[PDB]
Amino acid sequence: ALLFTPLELGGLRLKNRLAMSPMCQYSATLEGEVTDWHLLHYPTRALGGVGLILVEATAVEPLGRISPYDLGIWSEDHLPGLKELARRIREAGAVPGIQLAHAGRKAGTARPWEGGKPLGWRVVGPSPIPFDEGYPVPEPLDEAGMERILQAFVEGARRALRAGFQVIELHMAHGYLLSSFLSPLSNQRTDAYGGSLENRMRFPLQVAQAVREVVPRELPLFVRVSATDWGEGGWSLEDTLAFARRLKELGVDLLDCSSGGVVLRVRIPLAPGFQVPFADAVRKRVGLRTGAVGLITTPEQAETLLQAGSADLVLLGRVLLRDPYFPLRAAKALGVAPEVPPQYQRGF
Amino acid sequence: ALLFTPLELGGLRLKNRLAMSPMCQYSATLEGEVTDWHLLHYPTRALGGVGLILVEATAVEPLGRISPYDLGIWSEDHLPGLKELARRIREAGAVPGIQLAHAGRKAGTARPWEGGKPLGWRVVGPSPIPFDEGYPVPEPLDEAGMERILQAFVEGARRALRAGFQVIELHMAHGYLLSSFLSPLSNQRTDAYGGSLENRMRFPLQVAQAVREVVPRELPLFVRVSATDWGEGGWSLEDTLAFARRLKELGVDLLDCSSGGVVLRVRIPLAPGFQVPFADAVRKRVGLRTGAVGLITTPEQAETLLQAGSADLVLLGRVLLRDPYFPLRAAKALGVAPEVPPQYQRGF
Numbered sequence: 001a002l003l004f005t006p007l008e009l010g011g012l013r014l015k016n017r018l019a020m021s022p023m024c025q026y027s028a029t030l031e032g033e034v035t036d037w038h039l040l041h042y043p044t045r046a047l048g049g050v051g052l053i054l055v056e057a058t059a060v061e062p063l064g065r066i067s068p069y070d071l072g073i074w075s076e077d078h079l080p081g082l083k084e085l086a087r088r089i090r091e092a093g094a095v096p097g098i099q100l101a102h103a104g105r106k107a108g109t110a111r112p113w114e115g116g117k118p119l120g121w122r123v124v125g126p127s128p129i130p131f132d133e134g135y136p137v138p139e140p141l142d143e144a145g146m147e148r149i150l151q152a153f154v155e156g157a158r159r160a161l162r163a164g165f166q167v168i169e170l171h172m173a174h175g176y177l178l179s180s181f182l183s184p185l186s187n188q189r190t191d192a193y194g195g196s197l198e199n200r201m202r203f204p205l206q207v208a209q210a211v212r213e214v215v216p217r218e219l220p221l222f223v224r225v226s227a228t229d230w231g232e233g234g235w236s237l238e239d240t241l242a243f244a245r246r247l248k249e250l251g252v253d254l255l256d257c258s259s260g261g262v263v264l265r266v267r268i269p270l271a272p273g274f275q276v277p278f279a280d281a282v283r284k285r286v287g288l289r290t291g292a293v294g295l296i297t298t299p300e301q302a303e304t305l306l307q308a309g310s311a312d313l314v315l316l317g318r319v320l321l322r323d324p325y326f327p328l329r330a331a332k333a334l335g336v337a338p339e340v341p342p343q344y345q346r347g348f
Numbered sequence: 349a350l351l352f353t354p355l356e357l358g359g360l361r362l363k364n365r366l367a368m369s370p371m372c373q374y375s376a377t378l379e380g381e382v383t384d385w386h387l388l389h390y391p392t393r394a395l396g397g398v399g400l401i402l403v404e405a406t407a408v409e410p411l412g413r414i415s416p417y418d419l420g421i422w423s424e425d426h427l428p429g430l431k432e433l434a435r436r437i438r439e440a441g442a443v444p445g446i447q448l449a450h451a452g453r454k455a456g457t458a459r460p461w462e463g464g465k466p467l468g469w470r471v472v473g474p475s476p477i478p479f480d481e482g483y484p485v486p487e488p489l490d491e492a493g494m495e496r497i498l499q500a501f502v503e504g505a506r507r508a509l510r511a512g513f514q515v516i517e518l519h520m521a522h523g524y525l526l527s528s529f530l531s532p533l534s535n536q537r538t539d540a541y542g543g544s545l546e547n548r549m550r551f552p553l554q555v556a557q558a559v560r561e562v563v564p565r566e567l568p569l570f571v572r573v574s575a576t577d578w579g580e581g582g583w584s585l586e587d588t589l590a591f592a593r594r595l596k597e598l599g600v601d602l603l604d605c606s607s608g609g610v611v612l613r614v615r616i617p618l619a620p621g622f623q624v625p626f627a628d629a630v631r632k633r634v635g636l637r638t639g640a641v642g643l644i645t646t647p648e649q650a651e652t653l654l655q656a657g658s659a660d661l662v663l664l665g666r667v668l669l670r671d672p673y674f675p676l677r678a679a680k681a682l683g684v685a686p687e688v689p690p691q692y693q694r695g696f
C-alpha cells in the first residue's frame with residue numbers, strides 16, 4: 001500500500017503520502033493572527049492521519065491578502081500564533097507546512113459567506129487588467145515593487161521556519177500574484193517580465209530561487225502552479241513542463257499541480273482526478289516530484305494514481321473538510337492497520 | 349427526516365436526534381481535571397453536528413473512578429476546567445451534557461492501552477463479591493456510605509449545572525455502582541437494599557430522586573441502565589420496565605438503554621441495533637422517552653428506528669471516534685441540507 005508508505009522529501013520522512021491541501025478559512029484576526037478556529041481545525045486533521053498538513057494561503061504582505069481575515073506572516077508578531085499552530089499540528093502527529101501567498105489582482109474580497117465582493121484595495125498586478133467585472137484595476141508593478149514582494153516572500157519563509165514549519169509551499173497558482181505573471185491572459189507586459197515564456201517565468205523564478213536560498217535542503221520547498229489556465233492561448237501544460245525544469249534546476253523539491261483561477265470565463269472539465277494528468281506529465285517528463293490534487297476522494301483512487309507513477313504525494317482538500325479522519329479509515333480500507341490515538345483504538 | 353428534527357426535552361430544544369454517547373478517554377490529570385485532550389476531542393464532535401454531547405463518565409468521588417485519569421467532579425477546583433469544556437462544546441453548536449458516575453466494584457483499573465489491571469483501591473459495592481478474578485473484593489456500603497455517595501452525586505450534579513451543563517445523565521449501567529445494586533449477580537444484601545426487586549431498586553431510585561431535586565425541570569435528567577445483564581437469573585427486561593416506571597414517576601426525562609457490564613462470563617448477542625429492542629419496550633410499554641445505542645453506524649438505520657417509535661434519541665459512540673463528522677454527512681445522505689460551519693460550506 002503505497003499511500004501508507006513513508007515518503008522521503010528533503011531530510012524529512014512523511015509517515016504516509018496523504019497531505020492536507022491548503023484551504024483558506026477566513027478566520028484569522030484582522031491583523032492576520034491565528035485564532036482558536038485554526039487551533040481546532042488543523043490538529044483535528046492531524047489526529048485524522050495525514051502525514052503532512054499545508055496551512056492555508058498566508059499573505060506575505062497586508063495587500064497580498066485575499067480577505068481581511070486571512071492568515072498573515074508579514075510581522076514578527078505573527079510568530080507566537082504560528083508557532084503555536086505548528087506545535088499542535090506536530091503534537092497531533094503530522095508535519096506542519098505552510099503556503100506563502102500573495103493575492104495580486106484578486107486581493108481584497110469579502111469572506112465568501114459575507115458576499116465575496118471586492119473591497120476596493122489598491123491591489124497590485126503585472127498588467128493594468130481587472131480580474132473580472134466589478135474588480136479593481138490592478139496597478140502594474142515596477143521593479144522595486146517586485147523586489148519588495150520578493151523580499152516579503154523571502155522573510156515570510158524565514159519566519160515560517162522560525163515558527164517551526166518544516167515544509168514551505170510557494171503559492172503560484174489560481175490567478176493570484178505569481179500565477180498572474182505566468183499567464184498571458186493576465187500578463188501583457190512589454191518589459192522583461194512579459195511576452196515570451198521566459199519573460200513571464202522570470203519574476204516567479206526569481207522568487208522561488210530567493211526563497212530556496214533561505215530554506216536549507218533538509219526542508220522541502222514546494223511550488224504550487226496552475227498547470228493550465230484553461231484559456232484559448234493561455235498558459236498550457238507544455239509551458240508548465242518548461243517552468244518545472246527550471247524549478248527542478250533551482251532545487252525545488254516538489255511541484256503541487258492545480259489549475260485554473262486566472263480568469264473566470266473558461267470551460268473547466270471537472271472530474272475525479274482531472275488535474276492528475278498534469279502531475280503525471282511533469283513527473284515522467286521532467287523528473288520533478290509532483291503532488292496530485294483535485295477531486296481525489298477515495299482510497300482506491302489515491303492508491304491507484306500512485307501505483308501508476310502519476311505522483312509522489314496525494315493532496316486532499318474538500319474530503320477533509322467533511323471527513324477529517326478520512327485517512328485513518330482509508331488505511332483500513334486498503335488493508336493497512338491504522339495507527340490511531342490510544343483513546344480511539346476501540347473505534348477501529 | 350426525524351433524525352434531523354428537533355427534540356424538546358425539558359425546557360430546551362435539541363437541534364436534532366443524534367447524541368454523542370458518553371466515552372471515557374482516560375486523559376484527565378491525576379487529580380481529574382480537563383486537559384487539552386478533551387478541549388479538542390469534544391468540540392470536534394460538536395462541529396461535526398450532534399445536537400447533544402454527553403461527556404464521558406465523570407466520577408463523583410475519587411474512589412468512584414475507573415482509571416486514575418478519569419474526569420472528576422468532586423471538587424470546586426474541577427469547575428474551571430469543566431466550565432471551559434461545556435463552553436467550547438456550546439460554542440461549536442452542541443448542547444453540553446455530562447454523565448455522573450461511580451465505578452463501584454469495578455473501580456480503579458489501569459488505562460486500557462496500559463493493560464487495564466486492577467490497582468488495589470478500597471473499592472466499594474453492595475456486596476463482597478469481586479467483579480471477576482483478579483479484582484478486589486469490594487467493601488459493602490452501609491447506610492452512612494450510601495448516604496455519602498448519594499450526596500456526592502447531588503453535589504456532582506450541582507457542580508455540573510454551575511459549569512454550564514444542561515443535561516445530566518446518571519450512570520446506572522455497566523456493572524458500576526448503581527448497576528451493581530440493581531443486579532442480583534452482584535447484590536446479595538439481606539437488608540432493605542437487596543433481596544427483592546423493590547429493595548434492589550431502592551438506592552438507585554433514592555439517588556435519582558435526590559438529583560432530580562437539584563436539577564431544574566427546564567433541564568433534562570437522563571438515566572443510563574443496563575436493560576439486561578444477560579445472566580441467568582440476572583437483571584431482565586421485565587425488571588427494567590419496573591425500574592423505568594419508577595424513574596418516570598420521579599421525573600426522569602429519558603432512559604438511555606444499554607446492557608451488560610455486571611459480570612463477564614455471559615454471551616452477548618452483538619449485532620447492529622442489538623440493544624434497540626430494550627429502548628423500544630420501555631418507550632412503548634412505559635411511556636418514558638428513551639435513547640437508543642449500540643452499533644448504530646448508518647443514517648438509514650438511525651432514521652428507521654426513529655420512524656418505528658423505537659426511541660426518541662439515537663446515541664452514537666464508536667462511529668464518532670472514527671468519523672467525528674458523521675452527522676453533517678448523514679443529513680445530506682438523508683435529503684437534508686446540513687448546517688455546517690461557513691468555513692466548510694464548499695466541502696458539502
Ligand SMILES: Cc1cc2nc3c(=O)[nH]c(=O)nc-3n(C[C@H](O)[C@H](O)[C@H](O)COP(=O)(O)O)c2cc1C
Binds near residue numbers: 171258315
Ligand atoms: C474552502 C477552500 C479554500 C481553499 N484555499 C486554497 C488556498 O488557500 N491555496 C490553494 O492553493 N488552494 C486553495 N483551495 C483549493 C484546494 O486546496 C484544492 O486544491 C482544491 O479544492 C481541489 O482539491 P479537492 O477536490 O480535494 O478539494 C481552497 C479550496 C477550498 C474549497
Ligand SMILES: Cc1cc2nc3c(=O)[nH]c(=O)nc-3n(C[C@H](O)[C@H](O)[C@H](O)COP(=O)(O)O)c2cc1C
Binds near residue numbers: 346373521665666667
Ligand atoms: C472507549 C469507550 C468508552 C466508553 N465509555 C463509556 C462511559 O463513559 N459511559 C457509558 O455509559 N458507556 C461508555 N461506553 C459505551 C458507549 O458509550 C456505547 O454505549 C457503546 O460503545 C455502544 O455504542 P456504539 O456501538 O455506538 O459504540 C464506552 C465505550 C467505549 C468504546
